[PDB]
């Protein structure tokens, strides 16, 4: 069976991806910061017997471990996370930007850098970055997070050009307003399904007037990873329910 | 079962769409200019017993006929076609542009204009335009066709904003280098799989170094129409295998 | 001296363009629908002695008349207008879309189709379309106007590819929230500087928290027409003060 | 008088920017890595008496020194450079990507982080990044450089949203094929005007069939810095002569 790595599986698009990839018949190797602790890894493995958590934390280490134990990495889902911190540009430190770039650009780069050679040698593989739709509709005072996510989107697009010759599609999925259940990355049930202000905000700024679901994200990840539509390689997908809705002139209804 | 209209079914993305939608369990009502002739309609119906060709040619007429005979239109695939004519801007006539706009913008607009009310009333439906990736990577001297296709892409994106409130996703799929078998719209087997110059051109300008397949287009259409990933509403998909490849500096290999 | 045509001079970007081009030393030939009436044309010529209003209305006749009287057309500013009419997609007629594409796509196409040969023969000229920033940040229920403007933007970008061989730059300037003085196209003094609701809306949705000025538009038109920065050819300029501002999460200041 | 900082003045868009800003009446404070050597700084000051070279290298020290000596920083031109190194993704090291993001994203971020407070306090200033058009038309095997430049472009666009409230426009100018005279960043006279292969390549891939000039870049920088067209804030300018030209089908002329 085909192998798939999902990183930061407890957060963002991790569970939607891992669960739907597993249902599609992949062996899903799952990374997470919490899996440094045996108790957390074992608890996850018991709750999700169809998933295979690994303890390895860093990119080369993780790729090498999965390759040793399962033969090869057929699918990489780089589910990258970093807390958005809103500040006026002069109130950040430079290290605040470096941290965002490290988590949101250097990390997916390092994973591809470690796995690309084995994919190129057999001329097969799929690479998916989960990034952000914030560059499409940016908020004021989120300059660090948003620009790093744009770097990752362009990284995916550029990589598609060189890896296409080796039959390796590369995609970026950029969500916004994706319900993240009990993860703070980025729309947890509380407040986003519980507080009237937040419920009204989502109804206002998305065309579909709701949060996106983990199932929708997982369906897209599994579809791309299936090899059924490789000709989309290089695509940045905006998975944001039609966000942004743009405020209309006075006198028009919402 | 859910109904799906595919227009110009003999051409462009028509057969990939109709066949994969049918496999997914839709009743697929098929439009085509050739179905004005009973012999052509009956021959198609015999060759493809899982498809239902209609004789109706024009938008309101077609929507009304399918609604009368099958109850409702759940999915619209506006597979729009017009021959690309390359000319210096001053060598066209103004009517050359009007013809492109009529075929590539007014036609999908007219179809949505005719079907939107029934979708809005029941708060369900999916709309897919098959357009072109030419606006993403334009060729010189194709100003009429390319700009009309961009109008259609923007039409899809804008429509997603108003129809989202009614739970109707709207998408545009913009192909290039899609193999179109025995249709001249736009990459027929001859010359594109038979002539060495054409084979070499496709290898040069696409990242995956091949034509796209009807199966890949059909997989995307059926995935979007399935209701499995509505949160992509408003997306323009570039289905062009990583086109364009951009020419590199002297001294670098191809 | 160098000649420039500015169309619909009384509206949208017309006076900013005409007045700044004249100050930069162009002979500015002005079109306007009101110039069908001799009295209107003569009142304009008396108020603006540095401008030269023409009575011609149709693109071919206008280009021919300017060429006959002033030798050549060095700069074309296609300042296109159409009344934005907001409707749900099913409440338009198809003719409502044809009217929008005729005014916003066919017309700039016809003007370039009529003037390009003379510019190509001498290998000099500049072409500027004034379009819209609505495709960048679309409002719901403006599907006709917005998609036609996107067609015009792509037309300019595609035209740049063929005309660059002849040393003719082509640009599109897409405004939003440009103050238009007494013209209803699209942000007249009343209500946009006089009604508190409109004043508040402009402050909220633009980054600079004000309307754009005719002077700003004219400075950009004159700069591009000057031959000082031809290497921008093909650019779509968003002249919208940093619109759109995107609504932020609850808890964050405006 | 108004002050402007131009970084890496000997390279890329540095001299075009500095020389045209000076001609427009700015006091132009010039940074360059070579100005670590007193002899280099003094030779520059003697050749260009209208320019003021500074020895400071680090962003905070440079802004502080200009502010101390000349009162304030009115215009920042962050003319960022890094050597483009083409490699397959697996042949880079991770540090190769960190170097690119440090030079092309962290550095402009640090300069704005150091200068923004003084501009905000007085509600005036202009910020221009010189980036790259490579994200618009990416070459294969340049994943580090190209994705870092896209990060910088998005940084400028996001910054425009918060700084517009303070009347500070932010722009990114993304060049390609800009003639850079004796600088190797990125199109020096030799080989790009002297080697037939390079001459042919520029003719093929740009619409205007030539390199861009330092004067064209400087005209755009001075125009944006002038305060004449602030309503363009947030714009990414592609200063690439209509690049990329996209290869056409067999049978069509070049
Ligand atoms: Cl490691
Ligand atoms: Cl999200
Ligand atoms: Cl009809
Ligand atoms: Cl195609
Ligand atoms: Cl006339
Ligand atoms: Cl406007
Ligand atoms: Cl004004
Ligand atoms: Cl220093
Ligand atoms: Cl350059
Ligand atoms: Cl030069
Ligand atoms: Na372990
Ligand atoms: Na019939
Ligand atoms: Na007359
Ligand atoms: Na010093």
Short mmCIF file of N, CA, C and O in Angstrom, two decimals, chain B residues 95-200:
data_model
loop_
_atom_site.label_atom_id
_atom_site.label_comp_id
_atom_site.label_asym_id
_atom_site.label_seq_id
_atom_site.Cartn_x
_atom_site.Cartn_y
_atom_site.Cartn_z
N UNK B 95 -16.51 42.06 -35.17
CA UNK B 95 -17.37 40.89 -35.06
C UNK B 95 -16.60 39.64 -34.62
O UNK B 95 -17.19 38.76 -33.97
N UNK B 96 -15.29 39.55 -34.94
CA UNK B 96 -14.50 38.43 -34.44
C UNK B 96 -14.46 38.41 -32.92
O UNK B 96 -14.44 37.34 -32.30
N UNK B 97 -14.39 39.59 -32.30
CA UNK B 97 -14.42 39.61 -30.83
C UNK B 97 -15.81 39.32 -30.31
O UNK B 97 -15.98 38.56 -29.34
N UNK B 98 -16.82 39.92 -30.94
CA UNK B 98 -18.18 39.66 -30.51
C UNK B 98 -18.50 38.16 -30.54
O UNK B 98 -19.18 37.65 -29.64
N UNK B 99 -18.04 37.45 -31.58
CA UNK B 99 -18.30 36.01 -31.63
C UNK B 99 -17.66 35.24 -30.49
O UNK B 99 -18.26 34.33 -29.93
N UNK B 100 -16.44 35.63 -30.12
CA UNK B 100 -15.75 34.98 -29.00
C UNK B 100 -16.47 35.25 -27.68
O UNK B 100 -16.68 34.33 -26.89
N UNK B 101 -16.85 36.51 -27.44
CA UNK B 101 -17.58 36.87 -26.23
C UNK B 101 -18.91 36.13 -26.19
O UNK B 101 -19.29 35.54 -25.17
N UNK B 102 -19.61 36.08 -27.33
CA UNK B 102 -20.90 35.39 -27.31
C UNK B 102 -20.76 33.92 -26.91
O UNK B 102 -21.54 33.40 -26.10
N UNK B 103 -19.76 33.22 -27.48
CA UNK B 103 -19.60 31.80 -27.25
C UNK B 103 -19.02 31.49 -25.88
O UNK B 103 -19.28 30.42 -25.32
N UNK B 104 -18.15 32.39 -25.39
CA UNK B 104 -17.35 32.06 -24.23
C UNK B 104 -17.75 32.80 -22.96
O UNK B 104 -17.39 32.34 -21.88
N UNK B 105 -18.50 33.90 -23.05
CA UNK B 105 -19.04 34.61 -21.89
C UNK B 105 -20.55 34.63 -21.87
O UNK B 105 -21.12 34.30 -20.83
N UNK B 106 -21.19 35.09 -22.95
CA UNK B 106 -22.65 35.23 -22.91
C UNK B 106 -23.29 33.87 -22.71
O UNK B 106 -24.25 33.73 -21.95
N UNK B 107 -22.75 32.82 -23.35
CA UNK B 107 -23.36 31.49 -23.24
C UNK B 107 -23.36 30.95 -21.81
O UNK B 107 -24.44 30.58 -21.31
N UNK B 108 -22.24 30.89 -21.08
CA UNK B 108 -22.35 30.41 -19.69
C UNK B 108 -23.21 31.33 -18.84
O UNK B 108 -23.94 30.85 -17.96
N UNK B 109 -23.16 32.64 -19.08
CA UNK B 109 -24.02 33.55 -18.34
C UNK B 109 -25.48 33.18 -18.57
O UNK B 109 -26.27 33.15 -17.61
N UNK B 110 -25.83 32.91 -19.83
CA UNK B 110 -27.24 32.64 -20.15
C UNK B 110 -27.72 31.36 -19.49
O UNK B 110 -28.87 31.28 -19.02
N UNK B 111 -26.85 30.36 -19.39
CA UNK B 111 -27.21 29.09 -18.76
C UNK B 111 -27.44 29.29 -17.27
O UNK B 111 -28.44 28.81 -16.72
N UNK B 112 -26.54 30.02 -16.60
CA UNK B 112 -26.74 30.27 -15.17
C UNK B 112 -27.97 31.11 -14.97
O UNK B 112 -28.75 30.89 -14.04
N UNK B 113 -28.16 32.12 -15.82
CA UNK B 113 -29.33 32.99 -15.71
C UNK B 113 -30.62 32.21 -15.78
O UNK B 113 -31.60 32.55 -15.08
N UNK B 114 -30.62 31.12 -16.54
CA UNK B 114 -31.83 30.30 -16.71
C UNK B 114 -32.01 29.27 -15.60
O UNK B 114 -33.15 28.90 -15.31
N UNK B 115 -30.94 28.80 -14.96
CA UNK B 115 -31.04 27.71 -13.99
C UNK B 115 -30.92 28.20 -12.54
O UNK B 115 -31.27 27.45 -11.62
N UNK B 116 -30.46 29.44 -12.32
CA UNK B 116 -30.12 29.83 -10.95
C UNK B 116 -31.35 29.85 -10.04
O UNK B 116 -31.24 29.50 -8.86
N UNK B 117 -32.50 30.27 -10.55
CA UNK B 117 -33.66 30.43 -9.66
C UNK B 117 -34.08 29.11 -9.03
O UNK B 117 -34.38 29.06 -7.83
N UNK B 118 -34.09 28.02 -9.81
CA UNK B 118 -34.50 26.74 -9.24
C UNK B 118 -33.48 26.23 -8.22
O UNK B 118 -33.85 25.65 -7.19
N UNK B 119 -32.19 26.43 -8.49
CA UNK B 119 -31.17 26.07 -7.52
C UNK B 119 -31.31 26.90 -6.24
O UNK B 119 -31.20 26.37 -5.13
N UNK B 120 -31.54 28.21 -6.38
CA UNK B 120 -31.64 29.07 -5.20
C UNK B 120 -32.85 28.69 -4.35
O UNK B 120 -32.78 28.72 -3.11
N UNK B 121 -33.95 28.31 -4.99
CA UNK B 121 -35.18 28.03 -4.25
C UNK B 121 -35.04 26.81 -3.36
O UNK B 121 -35.55 26.80 -2.23
N UNK B 122 -34.33 25.78 -3.80
CA UNK B 122 -34.11 24.61 -2.98
C UNK B 122 -32.79 24.65 -2.24
O UNK B 122 -32.47 23.69 -1.52
N UNK B 123 -32.02 25.73 -2.41
CA UNK B 123 -30.70 25.88 -1.79
C UNK B 123 -29.79 24.68 -2.05
O UNK B 123 -29.17 24.13 -1.14
N UNK B 124 -29.68 24.28 -3.32
CA UNK B 124 -28.70 23.27 -3.66
C UNK B 124 -28.43 23.35 -5.16
O UNK B 124 -29.30 23.74 -5.95
N UNK B 125 -27.23 22.94 -5.53
CA UNK B 125 -26.80 22.90 -6.92
C UNK B 125 -25.30 23.09 -6.99
O UNK B 125 -24.66 23.55 -6.04
N UNK B 126 -24.74 22.75 -8.16
CA UNK B 126 -23.33 23.00 -8.44
C UNK B 126 -23.21 23.54 -9.86
O UNK B 126 -23.84 23.00 -10.77
N UNK B 127 -22.38 24.56 -10.04
CA UNK B 127 -22.14 25.15 -11.36
C UNK B 127 -20.65 25.08 -11.67
O UNK B 127 -19.83 25.56 -10.88
N UNK B 128 -20.31 24.52 -12.83
CA UNK B 128 -18.92 24.38 -13.27
C UNK B 128 -18.81 24.94 -14.68
O UNK B 128 -19.51 24.48 -15.58
N UNK B 129 -17.92 25.91 -14.88
CA UNK B 129 -17.57 26.36 -16.23
C UNK B 129 -16.26 25.71 -16.63
O UNK B 129 -15.32 25.69 -15.83
N UNK B 130 -16.16 25.19 -17.86
CA UNK B 130 -14.87 24.79 -18.41
C UNK B 130 -14.43 25.92 -19.34
O UNK B 130 -15.09 26.21 -20.34
N UNK B 131 -13.32 26.59 -18.98
CA UNK B 131 -12.90 27.82 -19.62
C UNK B 131 -11.56 27.59 -20.33
O UNK B 131 -11.53 26.91 -21.36
N UNK B 132 -10.45 28.08 -19.78
CA UNK B 132 -9.16 28.03 -20.45
C UNK B 132 -8.11 28.53 -19.47
O UNK B 132 -8.38 29.44 -18.67
N UNK B 133 -6.92 27.92 -19.54
CA UNK B 133 -5.75 28.46 -18.84
C UNK B 133 -5.00 29.51 -19.66
O UNK B 133 -3.96 30.04 -19.19
N UNK B 134 -5.46 29.85 -20.87
CA UNK B 134 -4.75 30.89 -21.63
C UNK B 134 -4.57 32.23 -20.91
O UNK B 134 -3.52 32.86 -21.11
N UNK B 135 -5.49 32.72 -20.05
CA UNK B 135 -5.20 33.99 -19.38
C UNK B 135 -4.05 33.89 -18.43
O UNK B 135 -3.39 34.92 -18.16
N UNK B 136 -3.77 32.68 -17.95
CA UNK B 136 -2.66 32.52 -17.03
C UNK B 136 -1.32 32.62 -17.74
O UNK B 136 -0.34 33.08 -17.16
N UNK B 137 -1.28 32.18 -18.98
CA UNK B 137 -0.05 32.20 -19.75
C UNK B 137 -0.35 32.53 -21.21
O UNK B 137 -0.34 31.66 -22.06
N UNK B 138 -0.63 33.78 -21.51
CA UNK B 138 -1.19 34.10 -22.83
C UNK B 138 -0.15 34.03 -23.93
O UNK B 138 1.02 34.36 -23.74
N UNK B 139 -0.63 33.64 -25.10
CA UNK B 139 0.14 33.68 -26.33
C UNK B 139 -0.08 34.99 -27.06
O UNK B 139 -1.19 35.55 -27.06
N UNK B 140 0.96 35.45 -27.76
CA UNK B 140 0.71 36.63 -28.57
C UNK B 140 -0.24 36.32 -29.73
O UNK B 140 -0.30 35.20 -30.26
N UNK B 141 -1.04 37.33 -30.05
CA UNK B 141 -2.01 37.36 -31.15
C UNK B 141 -3.24 36.50 -30.88
O UNK B 141 -3.95 36.14 -31.81
N UNK B 142 -3.60 36.25 -29.60
CA UNK B 142 -4.85 35.55 -29.33
C UNK B 142 -5.68 36.43 -28.39
O UNK B 142 -6.20 35.97 -27.35
N UNK B 143 -5.83 37.70 -28.76
CA UNK B 143 -6.47 38.62 -27.84
C UNK B 143 -7.97 38.38 -27.66
O UNK B 143 -8.48 38.59 -26.56
N UNK B 144 -8.69 37.96 -28.71
CA UNK B 144 -10.15 37.80 -28.59
C UNK B 144 -10.49 36.62 -27.68
O UNK B 144 -11.15 36.78 -26.65
N UNK B 145 -10.00 35.43 -28.03
CA UNK B 145 -10.31 34.21 -27.30
C UNK B 145 -9.85 34.32 -25.85
O UNK B 145 -10.57 33.94 -24.92
N UNK B 146 -8.61 34.79 -25.63
CA UNK B 146 -8.06 34.74 -24.28
C UNK B 146 -8.81 35.69 -23.36
O UNK B 146 -9.11 35.34 -22.21
N UNK B 147 -9.08 36.90 -23.83
CA UNK B 147 -9.77 37.84 -22.94
C UNK B 147 -11.21 37.41 -22.66
O UNK B 147 -11.70 37.62 -21.54
N UNK B 148 -11.90 36.79 -23.62
CA UNK B 148 -13.24 36.28 -23.33
C UNK B 148 -13.20 35.18 -22.29
O UNK B 148 -14.03 35.16 -21.37
N UNK B 149 -12.21 34.29 -22.37
CA UNK B 149 -12.08 33.24 -21.35
C UNK B 149 -11.84 33.83 -19.96
O UNK B 149 -12.37 33.32 -18.97
N UNK B 150 -11.03 34.90 -19.88
CA UNK B 150 -10.83 35.54 -18.58
C UNK B 150 -12.13 36.11 -18.05
O UNK B 150 -12.40 36.01 -16.85
N UNK B 151 -12.94 36.70 -18.93
CA UNK B 151 -14.26 37.17 -18.49
C UNK B 151 -15.08 36.05 -17.88
O UNK B 151 -15.79 36.26 -16.88
N UNK B 152 -15.04 34.86 -18.49
CA UNK B 152 -15.80 33.73 -17.96
C UNK B 152 -15.25 33.27 -16.62
O UNK B 152 -16.02 32.91 -15.72
N UNK B 153 -13.92 33.26 -16.46
CA UNK B 153 -13.35 32.90 -15.16
C UNK B 153 -13.81 33.86 -14.08
O UNK B 153 -14.20 33.43 -12.99
N UNK B 154 -13.75 35.16 -14.36
CA UNK B 154 -14.21 36.14 -13.37
C UNK B 154 -15.70 36.00 -13.11
O UNK B 154 -16.15 36.12 -11.96
N UNK B 155 -16.48 35.72 -14.16
CA UNK B 155 -17.92 35.47 -13.98
C UNK B 155 -18.16 34.36 -12.96
O UNK B 155 -18.95 34.52 -12.02
N UNK B 156 -17.43 33.24 -13.08
CA UNK B 156 -17.56 32.16 -12.11
C UNK B 156 -17.20 32.63 -10.71
O UNK B 156 -17.94 32.41 -9.75
N UNK B 157 -16.06 33.30 -10.58
CA UNK B 157 -15.66 33.75 -9.25
C UNK B 157 -16.69 34.70 -8.62
O UNK B 157 -17.01 34.57 -7.42
N UNK B 158 -17.20 35.65 -9.40
CA UNK B 158 -18.15 36.62 -8.85
C UNK B 158 -19.45 35.92 -8.47
O UNK B 158 -20.07 36.21 -7.43
N UNK B 159 -19.90 35.00 -9.33
CA UNK B 159 -21.15 34.30 -9.06
C UNK B 159 -21.04 33.50 -7.76
O UNK B 159 -22.04 33.37 -7.04
N UNK B 160 -19.86 32.99 -7.43
CA UNK B 160 -19.70 32.23 -6.19
C UNK B 160 -20.07 33.09 -4.98
O UNK B 160 -20.63 32.58 -4.01
N UNK B 161 -19.85 34.39 -5.07
CA UNK B 161 -20.11 35.26 -3.92
C UNK B 161 -21.61 35.38 -3.65
O UNK B 161 -22.02 35.38 -2.49
N UNK B 162 -22.43 35.53 -4.69
CA UNK B 162 -23.87 35.66 -4.42
C UNK B 162 -24.54 34.30 -4.20
O UNK B 162 -25.48 34.22 -3.39
N UNK B 163 -24.09 33.24 -4.85
CA UNK B 163 -24.79 31.97 -4.77
C UNK B 163 -24.37 31.16 -3.55
O UNK B 163 -25.05 30.19 -3.21
N UNK B 164 -23.30 31.58 -2.87
CA UNK B 164 -22.88 30.87 -1.67
C UNK B 164 -23.94 30.88 -0.58
O UNK B 164 -24.11 29.89 0.13
N UNK B 165 -24.64 32.01 -0.43
CA UNK B 165 -25.72 32.15 0.55
C UNK B 165 -26.83 31.15 0.32
O UNK B 165 -27.56 30.78 1.26
N UNK B 166 -26.97 30.66 -0.92
CA UNK B 166 -27.93 29.63 -1.26
C UNK B 166 -27.31 28.24 -1.32
O UNK B 166 -27.94 27.31 -1.84
N UNK B 167 -26.08 28.07 -0.83
CA UNK B 167 -25.40 26.78 -0.80
C UNK B 167 -25.12 26.20 -2.19
O UNK B 167 -25.16 24.98 -2.39
N UNK B 168 -24.81 27.07 -3.15
CA UNK B 168 -24.50 26.68 -4.52
C UNK B 168 -23.05 27.04 -4.82
O UNK B 168 -22.73 28.20 -5.06
N UNK B 169 -22.14 26.06 -4.81
CA UNK B 169 -20.76 26.32 -5.26
C UNK B 169 -20.68 26.62 -6.76
O UNK B 169 -21.41 26.05 -7.58
N UNK B 170 -19.76 27.53 -7.11
CA UNK B 170 -19.49 27.87 -8.51
C UNK B 170 -18.00 27.77 -8.75
O UNK B 170 -17.20 28.33 -7.99
N UNK B 171 -17.62 27.08 -9.82
CA UNK B 171 -16.20 26.82 -10.10
C UNK B 171 -15.89 27.07 -11.57
O UNK B 171 -16.75 26.89 -12.43
N UNK B 172 -14.66 27.45 -11.87
CA UNK B 172 -14.17 27.43 -13.24
C UNK B 172 -12.97 26.52 -13.35
O UNK B 172 -12.05 26.61 -12.54
N UNK B 173 -12.97 25.65 -14.36
CA UNK B 173 -11.84 24.78 -14.67
C UNK B 173 -11.25 25.28 -15.97
O UNK B 173 -11.91 25.23 -17.02
N UNK B 174 -10.01 25.76 -15.91
CA UNK B 174 -9.33 26.32 -17.07
C UNK B 174 -8.22 25.41 -17.59
O UNK B 174 -7.11 25.41 -17.05
N UNK B 175 -8.49 24.61 -18.63
CA UNK B 175 -7.49 23.66 -19.12
C UNK B 175 -6.57 24.29 -20.15
O UNK B 175 -6.87 25.32 -20.78
N UNK B 176 -5.41 23.65 -20.31
CA UNK B 176 -4.65 23.79 -21.54
C UNK B 176 -3.93 22.48 -21.77
O UNK B 176 -3.62 21.75 -20.81
N UNK B 177 -3.72 22.16 -23.05
CA UNK B 177 -3.08 20.89 -23.45
C UNK B 177 -3.86 19.67 -22.97
O UNK B 177 -3.28 18.61 -22.72
N UNK B 178 -5.19 19.79 -22.92
CA UNK B 178 -6.08 18.66 -22.68
C UNK B 178 -6.31 17.89 -23.99
O UNK B 178 -6.87 18.42 -24.95
N UNK B 179 -5.89 16.63 -24.02
CA UNK B 179 -6.15 15.80 -25.21
C UNK B 179 -7.65 15.73 -25.47
O UNK B 179 -8.42 15.36 -24.58
N UNK B 180 -8.07 16.07 -26.69
CA UNK B 180 -9.50 16.10 -27.01
C UNK B 180 -9.90 15.04 -28.04
O UNK B 180 -10.96 15.18 -28.67
N UNK B 181 -9.08 14.00 -28.22
CA UNK B 181 -9.41 12.80 -29.01
C UNK B 181 -9.76 13.23 -30.43
O UNK B 181 -8.87 13.76 -31.14
N UNK B 182 -10.99 13.03 -30.90
CA UNK B 182 -11.37 13.38 -32.26
C UNK B 182 -12.08 14.73 -32.36
O UNK B 182 -12.66 15.04 -33.40
N UNK B 183 -12.05 15.55 -31.28
CA UNK B 183 -12.56 16.91 -31.35
C UNK B 183 -11.44 17.89 -31.64
O UNK B 183 -10.35 17.75 -31.08
N UNK B 184 -11.69 18.87 -32.51
CA UNK B 184 -10.70 19.93 -32.76
C UNK B 184 -10.58 20.93 -31.61
O UNK B 184 -9.75 21.84 -31.68
N UNK B 185 -11.44 20.82 -30.62
CA UNK B 185 -11.39 21.71 -29.45
C UNK B 185 -10.79 20.95 -28.27
O UNK B 185 -11.51 20.20 -27.64
N UNK B 186 -9.49 21.11 -27.95
CA UNK B 186 -8.54 21.97 -28.63
C UNK B 186 -7.24 21.27 -29.01
O UNK B 186 -6.34 21.91 -29.58
N UNK B 187 -7.10 20.00 -28.62
CA UNK B 187 -5.86 19.25 -28.84
C UNK B 187 -6.18 17.85 -29.35
O UNK B 187 -6.07 16.85 -28.62
N UNK B 188 -6.59 17.74 -30.61
CA UNK B 188 -6.94 16.42 -31.15
C UNK B 188 -5.71 15.54 -31.32
O UNK B 188 -4.59 16.02 -31.51
N UNK B 189 -5.97 14.23 -31.27
CA UNK B 189 -4.92 13.22 -31.45
C UNK B 189 -3.99 13.52 -32.62
O UNK B 189 -2.77 13.41 -32.50
N UNK B 190 -4.55 13.85 -33.78
CA UNK B 190 -3.78 14.41 -34.87
C UNK B 190 -3.98 15.91 -34.89
O UNK B 190 -5.12 16.35 -35.08
N UNK B 191 -2.91 16.72 -34.74
CA UNK B 191 -1.47 16.37 -34.74
C UNK B 191 -0.82 16.11 -33.39
O UNK B 191 0.37 15.82 -33.33
N UNK B 192 -1.57 16.25 -32.29
CA UNK B 192 -0.87 16.46 -31.02
C UNK B 192 -0.25 15.22 -30.42
O UNK B 192 0.71 15.33 -29.63
N UNK B 193 -0.71 14.03 -30.83
CA UNK B 193 -0.04 12.80 -30.45
C UNK B 193 0.68 12.13 -31.62
O UNK B 193 1.31 11.09 -31.42
N UNK B 194 0.64 12.72 -32.80
CA UNK B 194 1.19 12.08 -33.99
C UNK B 194 2.39 12.78 -34.62
O UNK B 194 3.22 12.11 -35.22
N UNK B 195 2.47 14.09 -34.56
CA UNK B 195 3.52 14.86 -35.21
C UNK B 195 4.66 15.13 -34.23
O UNK B 195 4.41 15.65 -33.13
N UNK B 196 5.91 14.80 -34.59
CA UNK B 196 7.02 15.03 -33.65
C UNK B 196 7.14 16.47 -33.17
O UNK B 196 7.56 16.68 -32.03
N UNK B 197 6.85 17.46 -34.02
CA UNK B 197 6.97 18.86 -33.59
C UNK B 197 6.00 19.15 -32.46
O UNK B 197 6.36 19.81 -31.47
N UNK B 198 4.78 18.63 -32.58
CA UNK B 198 3.76 18.87 -31.56
C UNK B 198 4.07 18.10 -30.29
O UNK B 198 3.93 18.65 -29.18
N UNK B 199 4.50 16.85 -30.40
CA UNK B 199 4.92 16.07 -29.24
C UNK B 199 6.04 16.79 -28.50
O UNK B 199 6.00 16.92 -27.27
N UNK B 200 7.03 17.32 -29.23
CA UNK B 200 8.13 18.02 -28.58
C UNK B 200 7.66 19.31 -27.92
O UNK B 200 8.15 19.69 -26.85
#
